Amino acid sequence: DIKLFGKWSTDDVQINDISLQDYIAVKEKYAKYLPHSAGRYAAKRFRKAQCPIVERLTNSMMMHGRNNGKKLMTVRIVKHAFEIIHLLTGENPLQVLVNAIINSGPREDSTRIGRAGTVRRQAVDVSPLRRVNQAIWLLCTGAREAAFRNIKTIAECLADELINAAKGSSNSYAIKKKDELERVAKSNR
């Protein structure tokens, strides 16, 4: 059968939000051995909704300048991070990943509508795919800026931030910026 990294299970994984249920593809036939797919997924529109979730966490992690082709460092960071979450929790860390992406994406968002000089924003609804991508970008960004100058390996930082956002801490930068956009959403309306 098919298990992540030779060992990790995918049939235990459950989606909570119906609003995000299709736009993460992890459960049945989008489980693969590695995040390294090396096929096109930005071919046309919405084809990066049917790419695997851990591939998205991988390909959004070479984001910074000096790392910008080095995907193998990224997949070992993913492997060490899943092992660290599997130690600190014990459960299947993919469930922690899904619960972290679900609990982190915004729900209302502010958009400047007017003219170039009328900054009179209007808090509108968040599209589900952009909620997915905004969540992945916040988790990677919290893994970045909390691992700039430390002793911690960036796999440890990603794993701990994924844990903290999976439970909705006041410690996750992702949950901090989600709460910030949700509070700005209260202001503009």
Added chain:
Amino acid sequence: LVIPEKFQHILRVLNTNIDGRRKIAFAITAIKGVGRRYAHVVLRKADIDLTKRAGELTEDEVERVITIMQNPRQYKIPDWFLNRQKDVKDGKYSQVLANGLDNKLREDLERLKKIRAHRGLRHFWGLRVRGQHTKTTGRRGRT
């Protein structure tokens, strides 16, 4: 590791406070006149394992290090790791360390001032010596 009980938290080798807890192959670099490659080729003939630190040592190791370090030809640090190959006076293949390092830099500058050469007046004025393209530089430290 272990807990070495003779641990001098301050080292004093050749008029220099050395942070003795630092790695031995990188705490000798801290003084002037010794870099990284040079202290390594010292330690390969100074017969101390790199695994240890700089505060884990015996003074017998310290005195044999300073012995090799002031006698660089007699202990097979041959004549290209040296700080000065052919001096103006004696031409002696010899290492020159911190106080003597500033002394011999000062010596060469005083000489080239006394020589009245193209270098010496640059060094008295404190400008670039190696013919640089200062059409956009010369920023920090000029007034």
Added chain:
Amino acid sequence: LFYDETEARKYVRNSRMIDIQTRMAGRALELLYLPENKPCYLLDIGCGTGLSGSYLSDEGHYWVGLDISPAMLDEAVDREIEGDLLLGDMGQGIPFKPGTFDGCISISAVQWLCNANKKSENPAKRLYCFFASLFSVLVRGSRAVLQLYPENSEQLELITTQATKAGFSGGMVVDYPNSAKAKKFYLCLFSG
């Protein structure tokens, strides 16, 4: 909100930021004919960490600084300033009695009045509230010089129109205007 402790520190500690803010503050003081060659009392509007306010102290001026950012003010605390720092939103008004200050200066700050994020009055209302109160808190014949970054010519015209309606006269000085990398707009005004 825009700044935090990390970013306020990185801005105030950057040598390139220090040099440019110092040059623009000294240029604003040269354009300020009312303090130029005179002692004066001053209000520094959008004072930040006090980089502009230190340079007011250099010419012997006594000053009050207004800023909306706590972290910019907290970084100013450790810089041995002689001015009074006040946590304040300039778009709600200038909270001094009539005729308090000889002059006012602002470096890199009033373009934020075109922004509609912080409060639920229109930028147009906040801009009027700023200029009308600013005219009042100034002495008669007092001066205001503001270096600012407009996004477009409509923002420049709106700022000019609001200052004009509040009773200010004067104009716009544009230094180095053929380089839109290095060009700087200075609003130079006087009260009645």
Added chain:
Amino acid sequence: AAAAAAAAAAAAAAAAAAA
């Protein structure tokens, strides 16, 4: 046999290059 295989591989490579 090995030699033959190698030759075949080479040929394939050449073809690819041409393409």
Added chain:
Amino acid sequence: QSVQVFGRKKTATAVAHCKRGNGLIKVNGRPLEMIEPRTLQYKLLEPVLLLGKERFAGVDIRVRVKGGGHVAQIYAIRQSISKALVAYYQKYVDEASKKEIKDILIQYDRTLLVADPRRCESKKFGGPGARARYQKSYR
């Protein structure tokens, strides 16, 4: 008694020579664990772990690899092993099990059996490469 096929990414060519054998898989004389980009081993192990090694029972599989880079060569070996098993069962065994294993591979990933449609293209004059061009100045 033998089938001779290939696999082709950007520059990587993977020559596959298979016949009736013993389950032997040589990649120029080395196994499928001895390739130093080793995490991609699992991608390199995708023809075996998806199909089961009992279907690779009595087949000699020789792999000779040319050109490319390491990741491109790994996907070329993956490509060539999958096409080699499919071509072997087509030429020497039924159509039905070949079609079945084709449907196992493609519905998992089409890139296993089909080629990649894109390469590092040539250059039309005016820049570093094809798309981005040189930079200028104003004022």
Added chain:
Amino acid sequence: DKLNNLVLFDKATYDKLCKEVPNYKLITPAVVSERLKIRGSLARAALQELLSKGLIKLVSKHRAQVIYTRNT
């Protein structure tokens, strides 16, 4: 300010490193390094000593990421 972590062991440092470490749910040289003011070199050599102590399982082992695990 200064992250000049302790380069060598101490009394109480080893009184926590021999003791508190097999009760963590996750034994990482960055974590052990981070909780008790220890350089990653020192904690890295100490965790290879904890291989030599035999208390603690070794799960992953790489260039710069070597994962240890408390037992049972």
Added chain:
Amino acid sequence: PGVTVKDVNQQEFVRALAAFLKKSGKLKVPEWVDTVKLAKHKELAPYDENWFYTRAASTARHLYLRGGAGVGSMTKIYGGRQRNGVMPSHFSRGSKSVARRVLQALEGLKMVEKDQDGGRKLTPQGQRDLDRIAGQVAAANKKH
């Protein structure tokens, strides 16, 4: 089933072939073993006190991987990334004299043979030895 050196983990084979050359003990060892880098394109000294031994082992194995490669090709294999200060990095090659005299020292053990073909290749003694130690590390692989 004559085992192949190519069918083993190569760097565990390098470490064991280094230990095998350590246990041998007979070789003309030069005197700049404790002085030099590998070439210009590195910065610091190597940490290995036996770096000559393991480089000789890896050089014998690279001779095993292809015959027809001279010292210049042995220079060219052991290349790397010279950092040119603030000017960008380039590829820079190995050191001629060191790799030449490693080949000379192992030539002393009748493990490196000069041919008619100009280069140097492995002796039949050498391939016998490498297949013996290959079976040693192969038993260290498929039976550990």
Added chain:
Amino acid sequence: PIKLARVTKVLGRTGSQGQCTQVRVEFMDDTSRSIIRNVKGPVREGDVLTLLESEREARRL
């Protein structure tokens, strides 16, 4: 209250740069109250949004 809601369409790209995609909205509370709202980012036909509230709607006329 939190309201999940079905997407029917994509009418246009309202805004100043083509940035608010226009979405007819069915509810998932089986009510036929089909309010047309504005979203930011890509939505295809048949998606499902999380409307924070149903009172504040997008602009008719």
Added chain:
RNA sequence: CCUACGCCGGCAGGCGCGGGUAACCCGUUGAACCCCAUUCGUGAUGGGGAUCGGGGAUUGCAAUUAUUCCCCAUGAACGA
């Protein structure tokens, strides 16, 4: 003049010895990142190597205002 190979050079380089007036000979054009182990452990530190002091070797009529390359020592600014 592109080089292979050998010898002598701790490192730049010399000396002998062929092919190549050219998909052939350099050439299978044997690269870098990458990877796997080691050491370092968040500070101006081994990051950054500038800024210089001694030499050494080539290019050439001619290197002084450092031609270039190499070997010690120097280690500023720089905290995104």
